[PDB]
Amino acid sequence: SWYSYPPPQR
Amino acid sequence: GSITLRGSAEIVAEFFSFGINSILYQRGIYPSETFTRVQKYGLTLLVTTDLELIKYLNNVVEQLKDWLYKCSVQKLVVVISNIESGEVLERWQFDIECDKTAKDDSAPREKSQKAIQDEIRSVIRQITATVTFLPLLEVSCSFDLLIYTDKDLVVPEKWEESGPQFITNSEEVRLRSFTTTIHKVNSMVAYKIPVND
Protein backbone atom coordinates (compact mmCIF):
# COMPACT_ATOMS: atom_id res chain seq x y z
CA SER A 1 0.00 0.00 0.00
CA TRP A 2 1.81 3.10 -1.21
CA TYR A 3 0.62 6.68 -1.60
CA SER A 4 0.38 9.01 -4.54
CA TYR A 5 0.88 12.73 -3.89
CA PRO A 6 -0.66 15.14 -6.47
CA PRO A 7 1.22 18.18 -7.86
CA PRO A 8 0.34 21.92 -7.61
CA GLN A 9 -2.16 23.70 -9.86
CA ARG A 10 -1.40 27.35 -10.61
CA GLY B 1 13.59 12.95 26.15
CA SER B 2 13.58 9.21 25.47
CA ILE B 3 12.69 9.32 21.78
CA THR B 4 13.61 6.54 19.34
CA LEU B 5 12.40 6.96 15.77
CA ARG B 6 12.72 10.74 16.03
CA GLY B 7 16.48 10.29 15.75
CA SER B 8 16.41 8.31 12.53
CA ALA B 9 13.49 10.44 11.37
CA GLU B 10 15.71 13.47 11.95
CA ILE B 11 18.38 12.32 9.53
CA VAL B 12 15.81 10.60 7.33
CA ALA B 13 13.81 13.84 7.28
CA GLU B 14 16.71 16.12 6.42
CA PHE B 15 18.00 13.34 4.18
CA PHE B 16 14.84 13.16 2.13
CA SER B 17 14.43 16.93 2.11
CA PHE B 18 18.01 17.38 0.97
CA GLY B 19 17.93 14.60 -1.55
CA ILE B 20 14.53 15.78 -2.74
CA ASN B 21 15.41 19.46 -3.04
CA SER B 22 18.48 18.48 -5.03
CA ILE B 23 16.15 16.44 -7.27
CA LEU B 24 14.26 19.53 -8.32
CA TYR B 25 17.46 21.30 -9.32
CA GLN B 26 18.79 18.19 -11.02
CA ARG B 27 15.43 17.78 -12.74
CA GLY B 28 14.10 21.28 -13.28
CA ILE B 29 10.89 21.62 -11.30
CA TYR B 30 11.45 25.40 -10.94
CA PRO B 31 13.84 28.37 -11.58
CA SER B 32 17.40 27.74 -10.41
CA GLU B 33 17.52 31.24 -8.96
CA THR B 34 15.63 29.79 -5.97
CA PHE B 35 18.18 27.24 -4.64
CA THR B 36 21.30 27.50 -2.50
CA ARG B 37 24.35 25.20 -2.65
CA VAL B 38 25.49 23.99 0.80
CA GLN B 39 27.82 21.51 2.55
CA LYS B 40 25.72 19.08 4.61
CA TYR B 41 26.32 15.51 5.78
CA GLY B 42 29.96 16.50 5.41
CA LEU B 43 29.64 16.99 1.65
CA THR B 44 28.31 19.62 -0.75
CA LEU B 45 24.60 19.45 -1.55
CA LEU B 46 22.19 22.01 -2.87
CA VAL B 47 18.99 23.23 -1.21
CA THR B 48 16.10 25.54 -2.00
CA THR B 49 14.28 28.23 -0.08
CA ASP B 50 11.10 27.89 -2.14
CA LEU B 51 8.24 28.74 0.22
CA GLU B 52 5.56 26.97 -1.82
CA LEU B 53 7.76 23.88 -2.09
CA ILE B 54 8.93 24.21 1.50
CA LYS B 55 5.22 24.26 2.30
CA TYR B 56 4.70 21.17 0.16
CA LEU B 57 7.52 19.27 1.84
CA ASN B 58 6.52 20.72 5.21
CA ASN B 59 3.18 18.93 5.06
CA VAL B 60 4.95 15.86 3.70
CA VAL B 61 7.63 15.91 6.39
CA GLU B 62 5.13 16.76 9.12
CA GLN B 63 2.86 13.87 8.16
CA LEU B 64 5.79 11.72 7.03
CA LYS B 65 6.51 11.57 10.73
CA ASP B 66 2.91 11.39 11.96
CA TRP B 67 1.37 9.40 9.10
CA LEU B 68 4.47 7.53 7.89
CA TYR B 69 6.57 7.10 11.06
CA LYS B 70 3.40 6.07 12.88
CA CYS B 71 2.67 3.40 10.25
CA SER B 72 6.15 2.26 9.11
CA VAL B 73 7.88 3.89 6.16
CA GLN B 74 9.77 1.58 3.80
CA LYS B 75 10.06 3.10 0.33
CA LEU B 76 9.54 6.33 -1.59
CA VAL B 77 8.92 6.98 -5.27
CA VAL B 78 8.79 10.26 -7.16
CA VAL B 79 6.98 10.59 -10.46
CA ILE B 80 8.12 13.54 -12.53
CA SER B 81 6.33 14.26 -15.83
CA ASN B 82 6.68 17.10 -18.34
CA ILE B 83 3.67 19.38 -17.98
CA GLU B 84 4.17 21.03 -21.38
CA SER B 85 3.71 17.78 -23.33
CA GLY B 86 6.10 14.99 -22.36
CA GLU B 87 4.17 12.78 -19.93
CA VAL B 88 6.18 10.94 -17.28
CA LEU B 89 9.86 11.33 -18.11
CA GLU B 90 11.67 11.03 -14.77
CA ARG B 91 10.85 8.99 -11.67
CA TRP B 92 13.10 9.31 -8.61
CA GLN B 93 12.62 6.42 -6.18
CA PHE B 94 14.43 6.09 -2.84
CA ASP B 95 13.95 3.54 -0.05
CA ILE B 96 13.43 4.55 3.59
CA GLU B 97 13.65 2.22 6.59
CA CYS B 98 12.82 3.46 10.08
CA ASP B 99 13.84 1.39 13.11
CA LYS B 100 15.50 -1.96 12.45
CA THR B 101 15.09 -4.09 15.58
CA ALA B 102 16.29 -2.15 18.62
CA LYS B 103 13.96 -2.90 21.54
CA ASP B 104 17.03 -2.54 23.78
CA ASP B 105 17.36 1.24 23.49
CA SER B 106 20.20 1.03 26.02
CA ALA B 107 22.85 2.60 23.78
CA PRO B 108 23.84 6.31 23.96
CA ARG B 109 22.85 7.85 20.62
CA GLU B 110 21.85 5.29 18.00
CA LYS B 111 22.40 6.86 14.57
CA SER B 112 25.07 6.33 11.91
CA GLN B 113 26.25 9.60 10.38
CA LYS B 114 29.47 8.43 8.72
CA ALA B 115 27.78 5.63 6.79
CA ILE B 116 25.12 8.26 6.22
CA GLN B 117 27.59 10.72 4.71
CA ASP B 118 28.58 8.04 2.21
CA GLU B 119 24.99 7.36 1.16
CA ILE B 120 23.91 10.99 1.15
CA ARG B 121 27.17 11.70 -0.67
CA SER B 122 26.13 9.39 -3.50
CA VAL B 123 22.49 10.45 -3.22
CA ILE B 124 23.17 14.13 -3.84
CA ARG B 125 25.81 13.16 -6.40
CA GLN B 126 23.77 10.46 -8.12
CA ILE B 127 20.99 12.99 -8.79
CA THR B 128 23.38 15.60 -10.16
CA ALA B 129 25.56 12.91 -11.72
CA THR B 130 22.82 11.28 -13.80
CA VAL B 131 21.58 14.69 -14.96
CA THR B 132 24.97 15.42 -16.51
CA PHE B 133 24.65 11.91 -17.93
CA LEU B 134 21.40 13.03 -19.57
CA PRO B 135 21.38 14.90 -22.93
CA LEU B 136 20.19 18.25 -21.56
CA LEU B 137 16.81 18.67 -19.87
CA GLU B 138 14.69 21.31 -18.11
CA VAL B 139 10.91 21.10 -18.50
CA SER B 140 8.22 22.60 -16.27
CA CYS B 141 7.26 19.10 -15.20
CA SER B 142 4.78 18.07 -12.56
CA PHE B 143 5.52 16.26 -9.33
CA ASP B 144 4.21 13.03 -7.86
CA LEU B 145 5.33 11.91 -4.41
CA LEU B 146 4.95 8.25 -3.57
CA ILE B 147 5.21 6.59 -0.16
CA TYR B 148 5.57 2.84 0.51
CA THR B 149 4.02 1.46 3.70
CA ASP B 150 3.14 -2.01 5.01
CA LYS B 151 -0.11 -2.33 6.97
CA ASP B 152 -3.46 -0.98 5.76
CA LEU B 153 -2.80 2.60 4.66
CA VAL B 154 -5.81 4.93 5.18
CA VAL B 155 -5.72 8.14 3.09
CA PRO B 156 -8.32 10.78 2.25
CA GLU B 157 -7.82 13.42 -0.46
CA LYS B 158 -4.19 14.02 0.58
CA TRP B 159 -2.68 11.03 -1.21
CA GLU B 160 -3.76 8.34 -3.66
CA GLU B 161 -3.63 4.74 -2.44
CA SER B 162 -1.80 2.76 -5.12
CA GLY B 163 1.71 2.98 -6.61
CA PRO B 164 1.85 -0.05 -8.99
CA GLN B 165 1.29 2.46 -11.81
CA PHE B 166 5.06 1.98 -12.27
CA ILE B 167 5.00 4.60 -15.06
CA THR B 168 4.45 3.46 -18.65
CA ASN B 169 7.93 2.85 -20.08
CA SER B 170 11.06 3.89 -18.17
CA GLU B 171 14.33 2.24 -17.10
CA GLU B 172 15.31 2.06 -13.43
CA VAL B 173 19.00 2.22 -12.50
CA ARG B 174 20.42 1.52 -9.05
CA LEU B 175 22.83 4.05 -7.58
CA ARG B 176 23.55 3.10 -3.96
CA SER B 177 22.08 1.56 -0.80
CA PHE B 178 22.75 1.55 2.95
CA THR B 179 21.37 -0.54 5.81
CA THR B 180 21.99 0.13 9.50
CA THR B 181 20.59 -1.46 12.66
CA ILE B 182 18.74 1.84 13.17
CA HIS B 183 17.61 2.48 9.58
CA LYS B 184 18.12 1.63 5.90
CA VAL B 185 18.11 4.01 2.92
CA ASN B 186 18.26 2.90 -0.71
CA SER B 187 18.70 4.99 -3.86
CA MET B 188 17.59 4.28 -7.43
CA VAL B 189 16.36 6.60 -10.18
CA ALA B 190 14.51 5.85 -13.41
CA TYR B 191 13.74 7.87 -16.54
CA LYS B 192 11.67 7.43 -19.71
CA ILE B 193 13.30 4.94 -22.07
CA PRO B 194 13.89 6.25 -25.64
CA VAL B 195 13.14 4.33 -28.83
CA ASN B 196 9.35 4.08 -28.61
CA ASP B 197 9.07 2.65 -32.12
Side-chain angles (χ1 to χ4, degrees):
Chain A
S1 347
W2 21 324
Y3 280 151
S4 252
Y5 220 46
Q9 217 298 320
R10 222 231 300 281
Chain B
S2 272
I3 48 119
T4 306
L5 314 177
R6 295 236 200 289
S8 40
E10 183 176 319
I11 241 176
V12 179
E14 307 263 80
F15 212 104
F16 148 107
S17 137
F18 241 113
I20 291 266
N21 244 253
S22 229
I23 311 300
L24 298 210
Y25 193 170
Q26 278 60 291
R27 217 307 158 279
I29 283 252
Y30 62 96
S32 282
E33 204 76 22
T34 1
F35 5 98
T36 196
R37 220 207 258 295
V38 300
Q39 217 135 11
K40 233 230 100 61
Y41 301 83
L43 52 319
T44 312
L45 3 165
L46 188 120
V47 195
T48 316
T49 99
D50 33 19
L51 266 133
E52 46 105 326
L53 194 98
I54 287 159
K55 241 68 137 183
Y56 120 54
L57 279 188
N58 241 286
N59 223 338
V60 186
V61 183
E62 265 281 66
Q63 226 110 31
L64 234 67
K65 213 220 276 248
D66 242 285
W67 108 234
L68 246 189
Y69 255 49
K70 203 145 138 80
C71 227
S72 221
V73 353
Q74 311 272 250
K75 318 92 192 259
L76 239 144
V77 167
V78 186
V79 204
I80 318 202
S81 58
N82 186 7
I83 240 148
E84 241 165 51
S85 240
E87 236 177 340
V88 186
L89 162 76
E90 241 203 35
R91 180 139 137 303
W92 244 88
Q93 50 183 230
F94 49 104
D95 227 273
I96 359 298
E97 238 218 311
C98 149
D99 229 65
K100 261 261 289 162
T101 305
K103 271 236 103 209
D104 283 81
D105 306 282
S106 44
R109 211 278 269 96
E110 266 207 305
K111 186 177 77 173
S112 268
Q113 266 171 285
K114 219 231 249 264
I116 261 273
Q117 131 80 246
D118 197 337
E119 219 57 27
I120 177 103
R121 174 178 124 199
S122 191
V123 142
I124 313 273
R125 265 49 248 295
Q126 67 188 231
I127 317 150
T128 346
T130 300
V131 188
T132 19
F133 145 95
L134 301 170
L136 187 94
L137 231 57
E138 228 154 282
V139 308
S140 240
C141 49
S142 83
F143 229 36
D144 244 310
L145 281 117
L146 266 142
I147 287 165
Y148 274 79
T149 79
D150 291 278
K151 237 76 238 71
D152 225 82
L153 184 57
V154 189
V155 117
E157 59 218 304
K158 216 215 166 121
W159 316 74
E160 256 261 328
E161 311 203 15
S162 55
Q165 298 140 120
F166 273 102
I167 345 184
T168 324
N169 280 282
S170 305
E171 178 107 291
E172 190 227 305
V173 187
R174 201 86 120 192
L175 307 143
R176 268 238 47 198
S177 62
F178 125 93
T179 320
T180 21
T181 181
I182 310 303
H183 58 315
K184 169 242 220 172
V185 186
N186 230 98
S187 337
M188 49 251 162
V189 58
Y191 34 33
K192 178 160 110 101
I193 48 139
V195 188
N196 59 79
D197 234 50

